[PDB]
Amino acid sequence: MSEQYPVLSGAEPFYAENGPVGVLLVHGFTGTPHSMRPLAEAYAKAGYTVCLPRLKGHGTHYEDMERTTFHDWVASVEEGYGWLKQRCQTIFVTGLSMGGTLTLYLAEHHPDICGIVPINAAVDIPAIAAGMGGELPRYLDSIGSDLKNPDVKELAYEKTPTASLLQLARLMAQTKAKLDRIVCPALIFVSDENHVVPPGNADIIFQGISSTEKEIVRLRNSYHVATLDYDQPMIIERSLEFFAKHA
Numbered sequence: 001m002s003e004q005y006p007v008l009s010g011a012e013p014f015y016a017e018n019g020p021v022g023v024l025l026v027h028g029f030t031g032t033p034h035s036m037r038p039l040a041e042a043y044a045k046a047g048y049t050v051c052l053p054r055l056k057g058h059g060t061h062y063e064d065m066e067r068t069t070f071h072d073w074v075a076s077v078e079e080g081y082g083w084l085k086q087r088c089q090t091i092f093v094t095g096l097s098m099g100g101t102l103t104l105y106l107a108e109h110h111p112d113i114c115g116i117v118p119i120n121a122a123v124d125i126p127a128i129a130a131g132m133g134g135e136l137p138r139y140l141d142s143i144g145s146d147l148k149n150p151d152v153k154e155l156a157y158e159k160t161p162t163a164s165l166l167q168l169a170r171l172m173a174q175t176k177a178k179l180d181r182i183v184c185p186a187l188i189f190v191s192d193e194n195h196v197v198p199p200g201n202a203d204i205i206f207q208g209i210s211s212t213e214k215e216i217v218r219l220r221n222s223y224h225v226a227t228l229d230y231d232q233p234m235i236i237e238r239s240l241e242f243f244a245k246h247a
């Protein structure tokens with residue numbers, strides 16, 4: 001399958017060829033590279049080779065998204081991973097929300113990942129589970145992003161295909177079940193206040209992985225879309241320190 005709608009302005013992937021250490025940045029469910037771009041540029045400015053891919057069916061139209069499965073999103077991250085492998089001796093992976101879910105997934109299936117930085121990664125959202133409750137419409141209306149800062153507009157679909165929620169749940173289930181395969185260092189960000197993903201998820205992740213070096217930083221001035229919120233500078237700074245520590 002291939003997207004039927006054109007890529008939208010602002011949703012372009014971002015690539016930067018610099019040093020031998022690479023960072024893969026993964027955006028979230030219904031989102032676009034916009035949400036991860038400031039992190040990618042800061043890392044690029046710091047001298048890192050950077051890959052920020054666009055997930056299949058994202059940044060085009062939600063009908064494209066509707067036609068995808070989580071295998072497609074996984075494939076989009078792998079292409080980015082593969083792109084960095086051609087260029088880098090050392091690879092870190094970071095991601096927001098489902099990007100974090102994809103970050104964990106990637107660490108579960110590659111042995112050569114140097115470290116991961118999941119940010120509000122999703123592994124258990126019981127509400128999504130609803131068994132499947134009653135019959136939901138085909139598309140759920142988005143009512144805006146979970147952000148503390150009101151003057152940020154995040155680039156994301158205005159509707160969510162309910163068919164994709166099932167895809168999300170499965171990605172989460174398989175990622176959660178195989179957490180013990182992650183052995184690389186982990187820097188885990190979690191928002192104290194989060195209206196999307198239960199913040200007890202960070203703990204499931206912290207406990208589930210086999211990593212010998214793992215930490216949690218609780219963000220106290222951000223909601224769910226933390227990468228664009230007030231704690232962005234800390235996320236960027238603390239991440240850079242992680243990369244240098246483990247290079």
Ligand SMILES: CCCCCCCCCCCC(=O)OC[C@H](O)CO
Nearest residue numbers: 028029031097098099127128145156
């Ligand atoms: C009946 C279902 C209600 C709950 C809907 C679940 C939505 C969770 C989406 C996961 C988040 C995502 O991966 O990225 C977050 C995105 O940037 C939000 O703007």
